[PDB]
Structures are given as structure tokens and as C-alpha cells.
Design a protein around this nucleic acid. Structure first.
Lengths: 167, 123, 229, 166, 37, 338
RNA sequence: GAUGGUAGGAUAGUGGCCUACCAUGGUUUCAACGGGUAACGGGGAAUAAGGGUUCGAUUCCGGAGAGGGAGCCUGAGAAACGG
RNA sequence: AUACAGUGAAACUGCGAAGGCUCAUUAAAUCAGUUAUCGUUUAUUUGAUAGUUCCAUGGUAUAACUGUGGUAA
């Protein structure tokens, strides 16, 4: 199997082609979200814990989180009949995705000891932290719209009053 | 004058006038008859055209079957074959129309599958 | 593919210009392309009548309204800025759109038949016409088929012509479409063939409908000027 | 529903050989949503542009109107005992227009005691329900079209007008 | 009583299902000695 | 691990409840299990898959494939339904709230016929193939699927019948009327055999029997009421019974056995809000299945310990009991998650 | 549902358009209802031509169909040539 | 022109395609005009048309993008 592993806070991710499936058999019949130990997948990474986060099997088909039935099934997604592998991992995964949420006993020259930075700082004002002439013009046009319309309406209602007095 | 459920009443005793040269009798202004689809109190409003003729049958209630013979200038066999027409019409509280009885009707708001006319006059 | 009213020569094309939506109906109007291009011939084709519409010479009913298929119906005063062109277009005696030339004090107004008077919402009397000028507050004695006179600078009714026996009426509709003379007879029926009847040179008689006729003035004094021959 | 057209049926002359047409969009008969009592759920269906139509199925908060003063106040629903536009409709206890349904009249008690002082001029066979709690009231509004349950109370003449029936 | 109880024969349901020979696993004598009383 | 409600020293679980980190540890079993704000009636077919759930507004048919964990289709039927059965696989017969009857096929809507009066219940006969339909009045009708005729309708008492069922191993036609009489007809003779009367000790008002059931021994009969009172019956001293008042007691609608799985002599009762389960020969509650909304009816999947309700909310609840039995082969990791 | 009445449902609303109840109606010799084609032809459906007298300009034959019936969705407008 | 500044592959966007073949034979029910809809829907065209306020600016969650990959696709 191949194991994709991601250390999210440092920003690191790498795949590891692990053969010798009795190392793999710790993950078997454990669906998405349930944690795992490093102790029964490896010896050189002990004290390790990985939250699984899906994985494409051979024939490339993804698993969506938490349905049932670790074979493939035909569901309705974003609505048409798409084929989707079950959330439970068994013997026939090509890659399996993992998030390491605690470093254990050995440094990794791919994951721990090497890291990438972020993209770019914020752009919004409140995101950087954590117009008034338009406020003049809006209020002035609003009070002028009132002093035009609400006076002109009564100014022809008084002409109706003149027609009613003359009639 | 109440043989059915569900508050047989006018729908807002009540009285109105369609105008346009057709009288409303005094029991149809102030009387105990409901006038659900008789256009003088009614719920319907008047429009369209007004047709006149005698009757054939008034067997069922709220069905006035008018006859209407009219002249048409036939050019084909150069003689007038005589016309005949039929139209069902709802009642009014002004005349129990029997056989004969040339009456007229005004077009309004299809009531059953085939009636758009309701009696407004008897003479 | 054309109507009869446009005075459209047959050797013109294949597709006829449908007018767009607007004040008047499709069946009682001519657009600006059939007005300017092939009737009084200020253009030669659709490209240059769109060019002068983008230049905005037209001032129909005192507003510009730059559009090719704008449905100018009855007596919308087409105003053109260059050479002070003021055109009131009415019906002739054989169904077409006779476009009379008028002057500025006559194109400062128009008239319109009232269609209905309503107590619509909030106690406001109400009046509509064939271009749909919903203008506020006429007198209570506006019946149907009377004639308001629009201001054409603001929208207000300035003068009013009452529909009664002995008024000068214009007939636009049916087999009497475009006749003037308004007096042999009056006959209001109760739903059809109801009208005031119109004379001829030998004072002949004619039948039409109420909605297919509308008043333009008095017996000898219409304040509209009319073309002659 | 199915249809709204005379083409599937016979006229006043007795014609035949129909075989007419594939039915259009504008013969649209939707399903009859028999509105019941439940928790308030209104389906917001579309028609004719943005003409949203409120199709109520499980409405409760009926605004029923005190007749002699015209006081439309809020109450619950119990059940319809008589409605012979379908005599099985009262067997199944739905809620349609012009039905006579029962109401616990406790806010009408509150309004009477609030704008008259004392508790109990009004008719005796509705004073019995003033005492007990359940009064008869007939639905005016259309939950299948406007989605609401409004109605008017039974007061005297209309009361006996229905009580002699059932 | 027009559409009410048309005692006619209808086309698609005339062979919609098919019967069974033995049917009840009991006997009819077991019916008689089941609810004699 | 899904949470469990408190009970009498026993555990139950719900999947697709009104409440059912949770988004990323979702425990959804059947995708698109939600209707248009209510539910009419759900039942599971005789074979190991293909459950059918009737609709609420623009009512549908909603066949779910159990070996695909999702929806197959939704045939929007013409009227709102009350009762139906399934006739194996693809055929099924329905009757709506109006007096009309639909025959769904693989293509769907094979016929629409009618009955002269408004109907309330339908059952099918496996032997000689006549569906019996109970309606309002003197009238309990037949539609035989052999030759499509009509049969000589069974003459009832005054008001009618709320439920009809035939016995399976021997065919004893039940008909739960309004005047407490159960009106057993014989599917052989087309005549009555008995008119058993139902009694109590409280006698609030003249209750009407609404639920009838049998099982596959052919000797007992489960009876209901319009009051929340289960009843058992045998031929052995058929005048008394054993009774079960329920703590809320409006109208019991679904009483079904456990006659094909282990932990025997147990029966499920179900009224409008609660569904409980108790044991025979004592009348003591094994468990109960209290949801957060009312119940339109229920059903129990055969061979295993799971239940499917039709309720008045947007989804339907499924109830798993890990002491009545296991979870089935298509749900065979429910025992691994909880 | 034939003909109408009362009420509800659905409607964009009128409407037996659909359902409960009720009445036994309605069209017709003053042509009901039914019979077919030079109904690949006809009805102005329209232009007419300065001599062709039923050739001589056109809209429409009827409704459907996007492999086959069924169900659903979108939109000012649809039971969509494009789901 | 050290927070933007022109060319611009590929992505969101506004719109485009805005009306095309064959098959079974309907007698004013297919069609044409006309009456009406205070019996009704309506984008666009046009004319009109808004008065409730107790002790200097509001929140994370997704793209495009990077990076690790699966699958014959």
C-alpha cells in the first residue's frame, strides 16, 4: 500500500510505499476519523497517531467519509449515479491518506525536519488586524429625495383639493 | 331556503348594481334569496354582449335553456333556412320562466362548463 | 409580411421590421426605421438610421428615445432638432399614416383618449391613455372616451374635451378607419355597433365602435391642425 | 392531479373520437395536499415566474376571528367533525377551507376577561364553550394555496346552522 | 353510481400474477379440526 | 460509537434521527433518506434488499437498494397514499386516499383502477391471488389478480373496517371494524366463521379496533384498538384475552411479531408517539423506542434486529437493537461502529 | 361526469378540471351524432402580375419524436432538439 | 511607480447557439378573424410610484494557487 501522511501545522506531506501487509493490517476495518497508533504499522515511528482522511483505491475511486460497506457502491453526488468506494479501509487500497497529529519517537527528514511556509498575508482590513464622503452624499441625496417627493405629492393633492372645491 | 351546509350566505342583505339598463327587483335588492351567481347582487360582474330569445326547457333548476332563431341572408340556395341556438343560463329571483318567454342575457364569467350568460330581463 | 398602414413599397426586402414593445400596440403604430428610412427618407438603410439614432436627433413626445423599432402610434409628435422638424402623424382616409407637418406651439402638446378612471390605491383618481400616461388627478367628470390634452413638458392634463352629442371625433379602427365629419347621427347601443356617426361629401352614414373612435375637438374648431389637399 | 382541459371529456352534445394531444405545461394539476395537524411545515413551490405558492400540510397556529367584534386571535386545532365535500375527510381528520374545526378557546377567555373584567349577553350554547374550552370555528383561509389557517368563530346563528346539521 | 363499481374485466391484471397449488401448508381437514369451535 | 438511549437494562440505537466533529465522523447509513417533511409508510421486501417508502408531498415510491445504500428512483404517484403491499420482485400494488388503486411495475404505473367507496386497507393473498381491500361500510372488496375480475363483496357491519389481514399458514381473514367486533371471514368459503367481540375493564368510550395481525403458527391473533391497548387471542378460551394498556394510549397502529428471529415470544406494539416491545405469556416490556417526533407507522427487517419507522419529520429513523439480534449483511459494520 | 346545483382540492385564475352529496338531465328532421377522399389537397392563408381565366405568391396538412414507454428538474415562456 | 499599474496560455464571470428532420392521415374541435378577462400570468417597452430607534464600519469558510497522490481513463 502507499501511505500519504500530512503534518498540517508545519505544512508537510509525503507518501511512503509500505509493503509487508501485516504492518498494514492495523488499519483494517477502521473507518474514517477513527485514530490509529504508530506501533502496529511500524516500529521506527512509535508514539505516532494518524487520523485517516480517506484514500483512493486501485481503480482510483475515492471514499467519502462515513457511509458503510468497504466495497464499491453507486451513490448520487454533485445529482447523478457516481461510483464511490466505502469509507472503511480494507486490503485493496492503493493510497491511504493520514494526518499525523502527534510526533512520536523519531524525527523524519521528510515530514518533521523539512517544512514549507504559507502563501501570503491578509488583504482585508479586519483580516490584517485580526467612505465618509459617500456617507455625506448618501444622507444628502436621501433628505433631498424626501424633500422633493413627499412635498410634491401633497403639492398635487392640493390641486385635487382645488378641483374638489370647484366641482 | 337553506338545504346545504357550509354557511349559505352572500360573500361580501348584500346588494349591488351592474348598471347598463337592467333593473334589480326589490326582493333581489333586499330579500332572503342568496344571489350567489345572479348578477344583481352576485359575485360576478357584467361585460361582453347581450343576447335575446325564447326558451325550450327549464327542467332542472338554475338551467334556463334559451332558443334563439335569427335571420341570416343566405346566398347559396337563395332562401333563408331558419336558425336555432341553445344556451344554458342560471336562475334569477324575478320570473319563473315557462315555455315561450322571450328573455335576454348578458355575458359573464363561465359558471358551469357551458354557461356564460345570466338572465337580466323578462318581458 | 407588412401591414397596410405603413405605406410600404413592396420592392423593399423580405423581413419586415417588427416594432418593439412600447406605448401603443403593434397593430396601430409605425416604428422609427419605417418612419425615417423609407417614408420621408432621412436615411437609406438600417445602419445609418441607427447612426442618427445614436446621434439622437429624434425627440418624440419631448423625450429622445433612441431606438430603431420604437412604436410611434397615433399623433406622437416626432420632433427632429435639425431644421426644427415637427411632425404630427394621423390617419388618412384610406388607412395609412399621413404624417402632417406642424409647428412648435402645436407640438408643445398632444391629446389622448381616456380609457378608464380608477380608485386604484389610497384615494387617488387616475387616468390612462393610448400611450399610457398615468397622470394624476383629473376632474370627476372624466367619462370613458373623452380627450385629455397632455402638457408635454411635464405630464399634466391642461385642457379637456368632453365626449357628447355634437363633438368632432376621429375614428381609428374597423372599416371606418380614418374618417372625419362626426355628425349625421348618434346611436349608443348596449354592447356593439355603438358610436357617433360621421358624414361624407354627400353626408353619408357610417357605423363603428366606441373604443374605435375618439374626439379631437369641436364642429369647426379643433386646436389640432389638419393636413389638406 | 392531472389536468385542466375539456379535451379529455365530453361536452353538452355528446362527442367521441378524442385522441387529442400530449398534455401541455399549462394543464398543471398538482397533487392534493390534504393539510393536517402536526408541526408547521409549508412547502414553497414555484409557478408563473417568481409566483411562490405556500402549500401548507401541518399547520397549527390558526388565526380565528371573534365574530361580533372581529378579533382574529391565535389558537390551536383539534379536528373536523363534518365536511361533506368528502365524508371520509372528517374520518381522516384533515384541515381544508370551510371546515368546522374545534378550538381550545383559552385566549378568547383571556381577551374577554381582559376587556370586560369579569368571567362567565352572548349566546348560551357558546357560553357553554366559554366555560368548557372547545368552541367550533370554520376555516376561511386556504392552506393549500396561501399556506395559512385563518377562520371565523361560530356565534349563534351560524352555530345552530351547523349544530342542526351535525 | 356511474364509475362506482364497474363489474368489468380489465386487461393488464388478467395475468398479473399466477396461483399456487398446495398453498396453505395446513390441510383443509386441519382447518375443520382447527375451528370446529 | 453512536449514543444509546436509557432503557430497562438494554440498549437501542438510532441512525438518521433528528439530531443525526459529527460532520467529519458522520454515521449515515442510507444516503438520501429524507422526504418532503413527513413520511407515509415504509416496508422492506421479502428478499434481502429493496425497501420501499411511500411519499408525503408530491408522494413518491422511493425504492432503496440495500446493496447500494442509496435511492433507486422516486415515481411521483398521482395521489397521496395510505396503504400498500409488495408482491414479488418488482411488482407492487397501492391504494391512495381517494378510492383508486395503482399497480407499479418495473416500468411503473401498470394500471390505475378504483373501488366504489373510500378504502383504508389492502392485503394480498398468496393462494389463488385475490387482494382483499377494506373500505368504509358494508363493503370489503376483492380484486383477483387471476383474470382481473371482481368478487361478490364481503358483507360487513355498519361503519366499516380499519384493517384487514389474512393468516399465512392457513388463511383466516381478519377485519378490524368500529364496533369492537373482529369479523373473521374464511378465505375458502367466502363466508363468516366468527364475530368475536373485544372487551376491557376501563371502557373509556366505544373504541374501534385498528390493527390486526397473525403469525406463522396459525393459532394466535394480535388485536388492536383506538385507545392504546394491545390484545392477544387464541382459540383456547377465545372469549377473554390478555391486554396491554400503554402509558400514553392514543391509537395503536402497528403490532408485529418476532416469529422469525431468535429471542422468541416477543412482539412490537406501536402507537402514535412510542413503539414498545414486550414478551408473551407475561406482558412485560422488553424495550421501547422513544423518538423525538410522532410515528406514522413502523416496520421490522426480517432475520435481524433493526426497525424502520415512517414519521412526521424530514428523515426516517432506523432503530438497531444489539441484544435482539445482529445487524444484517449489508449493514455488517454497524456492529463495528456501535 | 352524461346534464346541472352546493362545497372543497388544484389552478395563473373562470370552469364537473377532479372528488363527496344531491337532482335525471342535455343535443336532435330549423339536420344531433356518425361515413371518405384528386383533407402530397383544401380552406382567402396571402402576394398579386397591363390578357395565363381554377398552371400563375405563400402560412398551415393532423399531432408527435429526439432508441422505447414512465417519473422528476430549470425558466418571463417548456411537460426543453441542449438535464 | 518596493501595497495595484502593459502583453496575457488556462480558470470564475456577462452572454452565444434566440428555433432543424421524419413518421401515422384531424371536417370550423386543425385553422383564420372576432367578443371578453373588476375570469388571469407576465422578463423586457412606456407612463407613474416609500415616514415605528431605554443601560468612524460587523464573522469564519471556500476557491483560484501550492503541495502529496491514486486510476488504463
Amino acid at each position: 500500500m502507499k501511505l500519504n501522511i500530512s503534518y498540517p501545522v508545519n505544512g508537510s506531506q509525503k507518501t511512503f510505499e509500505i509493503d509487508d501487509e501485516h504492518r498494514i493490517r492495523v488499519f483494517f476495518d477502521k473507518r474514517i476519523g477513527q485514530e490509529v497508533d504508530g506501533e502496529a504499522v511500524g516500529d521506527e515511528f512509535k508514539g505516532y497517531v494518524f487520523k485517516i482522511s480517506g484514500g483512493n483505491d486501485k481503480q482510483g475511486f475515492p471514499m467519502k467519509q462515513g457511509v458503510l460497506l468497504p466495497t464499491r457502491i453507486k451513490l448520487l453526488l454533485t445529482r447523478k449515479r457516481k461510483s464511490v468506494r466505502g469509507a472503511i479501509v480494507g486490503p485493496d487500497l492503493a493510497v491511504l491518506a493520514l494526518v499525523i497529529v502527534k510526533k512520536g519517537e523519531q524525527e523524519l527528514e521528510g515530514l518533521t525536519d523539512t517544512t514549507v511556509p504559507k502563501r501570503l498575508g491578509p488583504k482585508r482590513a479586519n483580516n490584517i488586524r485580526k467612505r465618509l464622503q459617500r456617507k455625506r452624499h448618501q444622507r444628502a441625496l436621501k433628505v433631498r429625495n424626501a424633500q422633493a417627493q413627499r412635498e410634491a405629492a401633497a403639492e398635487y393633492a392640493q390641486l385635487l383639493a382645488k378641483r374638489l372645491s370647484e366641482r | 331556503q337553506s338545504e346545504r351546509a357550509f354557511q349559505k350566505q352572500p360573500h361580501i342583505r348584500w346588494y349591488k348594481n351592474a348598471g347598463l339598463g337592467f333593473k334589480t327587483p326589490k326582493t333581489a335588492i333586499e330579500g332572503s334569496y342568496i344571489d350567489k351567481k345572479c348578477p344583481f347582487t352576485g359575485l360576478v360582474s357584467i361585460r361582453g354582449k347581450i343576447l335575446t330569445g325564447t326558451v325550450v326547457s327549464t327542467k332542472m333548476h338554475r338551467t334556463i335553456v334559451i332558443r334563439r332563431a335569427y335571420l341570416h341572408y343566405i346566398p347559396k340556395y337563395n332562401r333563408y333556412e331558419k336558425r336555432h341556438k341553445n344556451v344554458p343560463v342560471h336562475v334569477s329571483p324575478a320570473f319563473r320562466v315557462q315555455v315561450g318567454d322571450i328573455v335576454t342575457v348578458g355575458q359573464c364569467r363561465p359558471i358551469s362548463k357551458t354557461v356564460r350568460f345570466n338572465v337580466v330581463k323578462v318581458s | 409580411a407588412a401591414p397596410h398602414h405603413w405605406l410600404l413599397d413592396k420592392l423593399s426586402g423580405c423581413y419586415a421590421p417588427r416594432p418593439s414593445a412600447g406605448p401603443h400596440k403593434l397593430r396601430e403604430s409605425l416604428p422609427l426605421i419605417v418612419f425615417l428610412r423609407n417614408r420621408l427618407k432621412y436615411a437609406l438603410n438600417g445602419r445609418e438610421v441607427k447612426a442618427i439614432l445614436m446621434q439622437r436627433h429624434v425627440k418624440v413626445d419631448g423625450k429622445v428615445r433612441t431606438d430603431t423599432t420604437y412604436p410611434a402610434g397615433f399623433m406622437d409628435v416626432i420632433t427632429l432638432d435639425a431644421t426644427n422638424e415637427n411632425f404630427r402623424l394621423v390617419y388618412d382616409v384610406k388607412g395609412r399614416f399621413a404624417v402632417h407637418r406642424i409647428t412648435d406651439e402645436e407640438a408643445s402638446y398632444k391629446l389622448g383618449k381616456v380609457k378608464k378612471v380608477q380608485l386604484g390605491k389610497k384615494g387617488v383618481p387616475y387616468v390612462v391613455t393610448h400611450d399610457g400616461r398615468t397622470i394624476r388627478y383629473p376632474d370627476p367628470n372624466i367619462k370613458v372616451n373623452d380627450t385629455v390634452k397632455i402638457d408635454l413638458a411635464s405630464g399634466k392634463i391642461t385642457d379637456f374635451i368632453k365626449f357628447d352629442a355634437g363633438k368632432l371625433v376621429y375614428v381609428t379602427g374597423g372599416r371606418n378607419l380614418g374618417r372625419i365629419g362626426t355628425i349625421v347621427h348618434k346611436e349608443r347601443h348596449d354592447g356593439g355597433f355603438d358610436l357617433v356617426h360621421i358624414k361624407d361629401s354627400l353626408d353619408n352614414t357610417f357605423v363603428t365602435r366606441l373604443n374605435n373612435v375618439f374626439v379631437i375637438g369641436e364642429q369647426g374648431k379643433p386646436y389640432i391642425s389638419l393636413p389638406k389637399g | 392531479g392531472i389536468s385542466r382541459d375539456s379535451r379529455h371529456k365530453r361536452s353538452a352534445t355528446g362527442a367521441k373520437r378524442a385522441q387529442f394531444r400530449k398534455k401541455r405545461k399549462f394543464e398543471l394539476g398538482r397533487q392534493p395536499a390534504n393539510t393536517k395537524i402536526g408541526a408547521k411545515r409549508i412547502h414553497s413551490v414555484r409557478t408563473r415566474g417568481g409566483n411562490k405558492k405556500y402549500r401548507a400540510l401541518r399547520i397549527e397556529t390558526g388565526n380565528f376571528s371573534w365574530a361580533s367584534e372581529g378579533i382574529s386571535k391565535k389558537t390551536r386545532i383539534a379536528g373536523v367533525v363534518y365536511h361533506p365535500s368528502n365524508n371520509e375527510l372528517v374520518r381522516t381528520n384533515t384541515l381544508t377551507k370551510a371546515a368546522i374545526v374545534q378550538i381550545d378557546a383559552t385566549p378568547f377567555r383571556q381577551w374577554f376577561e381582559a376587556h370586560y373584567g369579569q368571567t362567565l349577553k352572548i349566546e348560551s350554547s357558546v357560553e357553554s364553550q366559554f366555560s368548557a374550552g372547545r368552541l367550533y370555528a370554520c376555516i376561511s383561509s386556504r392552506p393549500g394555496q396561501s399556506g395559512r389557517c385563518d377562520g371565523y368563530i361560530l356565534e349563534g346563528e351560524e352555530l345552530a346552522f351547523y349544530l342542526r346539521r351535525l | 353510481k356511474g364509475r362506482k363499481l364497474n363489474y368489468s374485466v380489465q386487461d393488464p391484471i388478467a395475468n398479473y400474477e399466477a396461483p399456487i397449488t398446495s398453498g396453505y401448508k395446513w390441510s383443509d381437514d386441519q382447518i375443520d379440526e382447527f375451528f370446529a369451535g | 460509537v453512536l449514543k444509546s438511549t436509557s432503557a430497562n437494562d438494554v440498549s437501542v440505537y438510532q441512525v438518521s434521527g433528528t439530531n443525526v466533529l459529527e460532520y467529519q465522523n458522520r454515521v449515515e447509513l442510507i444516503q438520501d433518506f429524507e422526504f418532503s417533511e413527513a413520511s407515509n409508510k415504509i416496508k422492506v421486501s421479502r428478499d434481502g434488499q429493496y425497501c420501499m417508502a411511500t411519499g408525503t408531498y408530491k408522494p413518491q415510491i422511493h425504492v432503496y437498494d440495500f446493496a447500494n445504500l442509496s435511492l433507486k428512483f422516486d415515481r411521483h404517484t398521482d395521489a397521496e397514499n395510505v396503504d400498500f403491499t409488495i408482491l414479488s420482485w418488482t411488482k407492487s400494488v397501492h391504494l391512495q386516499n381517494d378510492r383508486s388503486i395503482q399497480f407499479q411495475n418495473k416500468g411503473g404505473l401498470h394500471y390505475t383502477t378504483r373501488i366504489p367507496k373510500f378504502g383504508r386497507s389492502l392485503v394480498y393473498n398468496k393462494v389463488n391471488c385475490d387482494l382483499y381491500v377494506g373500505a368504509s361500510g358494508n363493503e370489503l372488496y376483492r380484486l383477483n389478480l387471476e383474470k382481473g375480475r371482481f368478487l361478490n363483496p364481503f358483507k360487513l357491519d355498519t361503519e366499516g373496517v380499519n384493517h384487514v389481514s389474512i393468516n399465512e399458514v392457513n388463511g383466516l381473514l381478519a377485519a378490524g371494524t368500529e364496533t369492537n367486533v373482529v369479523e373473521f371471514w374464511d378465505p375458502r368459503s367466502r363466508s363468516r366463521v366468527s364475530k368475536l367481540y373485544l372487551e376491557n375493564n376501563i371502557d373509556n368510550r366505544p373504541f374501534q379496533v385498528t390493527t390486526t395481525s397473525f403469525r406463522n403458527d396459525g393459532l394466535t391473533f394480535a388485536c388492536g384498538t383506538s385507545n392504546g391497548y394491545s390484545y392477544i387471542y387464541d382459540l383456547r378460551t377465545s372469549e377473554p384475552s390478555i391486554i396491554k394498556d400503554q402509558g400514553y394510549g392514543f391509537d395503536i397502529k402497528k403490532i408485529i411479531w418476532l416469529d422469525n428471529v431468535g429471542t422468541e415470544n416477543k412482539i412490537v406494539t406501536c402507537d402514535k408517539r412510542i413503539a414498545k416491545i414486550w414478551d408473551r405469556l407475561d406482558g412485560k416490556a422488553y424495550a421501547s423506542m422513544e423518538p423525538s417526533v410522532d410515528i406514522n407507522d413502523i416496520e421490522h427487517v426480517p432475520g435481524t434486529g433493526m426497525f424502520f419507522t415512517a414519521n412526521e419529520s424530514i428523515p426516517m429513523h432506523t432503530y438497531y437493537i444489539p441484544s435482539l439480534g445482529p445487524s444484517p449483511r449489508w449493514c455488517s459494520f454497524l456492529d463495528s461502529i456501535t
